[PDB]
Design a binder for this molecule. Structure first.
Ligand SMILES: *[C@@H]1O[C@H](CO)[C@@H](O[C@@H]2O[C@H](CO)[C@@H](O)[C@H](O)[C@H]2NC(C)=O)[C@H](O)[C@H]1NC(C)=O
Ligand SMILES: *[C@@H]1O[C@H](CO)[C@@H](O)[C@H](O)[C@H]1NC(C)=O
Ligand SMILES: *[C@@H]1O[C@H](CO)[C@@H](O)[C@H](O)[C@H]1NC(C)=O
Lengths: 111, 49
């Protein structure tokens, strides 16, 4: 009944869509799901790892910052310093109050 | 009509029904529950304005 934002990442490219999807309760993709209605924006471009992201929603723009480094810690976040360079800036123009992450599963159970 | 105002550089597309009081019009356009969209009616007869 309102618009939404969808950023997924398959094996090569990244696709971002601001259509009017109707979402299932357990969305994932198997080792897949996206609707298409009234779609107003689209953009396609190109435990030893740690990848950090910052999302902001300012004045009809979506801002993403990113940095990745190799770690070798047991299970925590490291006690060093590193700064996050800017990545992309998208003119989506929507309202965002909730979010949810996606996972790459093995056994498809559309619960 | 709308609930609150708009932020800068956002747009709101939603086919909903906006009620004025305590009565929850669930898909009904009866009393105090109206359609939020309205046409203009541009004629070549109309004065500038
Ligand atoms: C962005 O979306 C949120 C969520 O729908 C809106 O917050 C709602 O605002 C109305 C009116 O103030 C309240 O009755 C609801 O309870 C709010 N919902 C939540 C979850 O807090 C918000 O108004 C929207 N932004 C704009 C500018 O309209
Ligand atoms: C990712 O998905 C798009 C369609 O959403 C597809 O066109 C593209 O080939 C995919 N990338 C792959 C398979 O590497
Ligand atoms: C999506 O586009 C169709 C085609 O004009 C339209 O009938 C429908 O109302 C649109 N949905 C919106 C604006 O939410």
């Amino acid at each position: 009944k309102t618009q939404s934002l969808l950023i997924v990442n398959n094996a090569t490219n990244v696709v971002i869509k601001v259509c009017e999807f109707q979402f299932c309760n357990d969305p994932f993709l198997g080792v897949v799901y996206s609707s298409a209605n009234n779609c107003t924006f689209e953009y396609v471009s190109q435990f030893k790892n740690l990848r950090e992201f910052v999302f902001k929603n300012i004045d009809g723009y979506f801002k993403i910052y990113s940095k990745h480094t190799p770690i070798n810690l047991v299970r925590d976040l490291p006690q060093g310093f590193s700064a996050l360079e800017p990545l992309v800036d998208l003119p989506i123009g929507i309202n965002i109050t909730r979010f949810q992450t996606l996972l790459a599963l093995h056994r498809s159970y559309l619960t | 009509f709308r609930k609150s105002n708009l932020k800068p550089f956002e747009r709101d597309i939603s086919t909903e029904i906006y009620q004025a009081g305590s009565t929850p019009c669930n898909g009904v356009e009866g009393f105090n529950c109206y359609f939020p969209l309205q046409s203009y009616g541009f004629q070549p007869t109309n004065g500038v304005g």
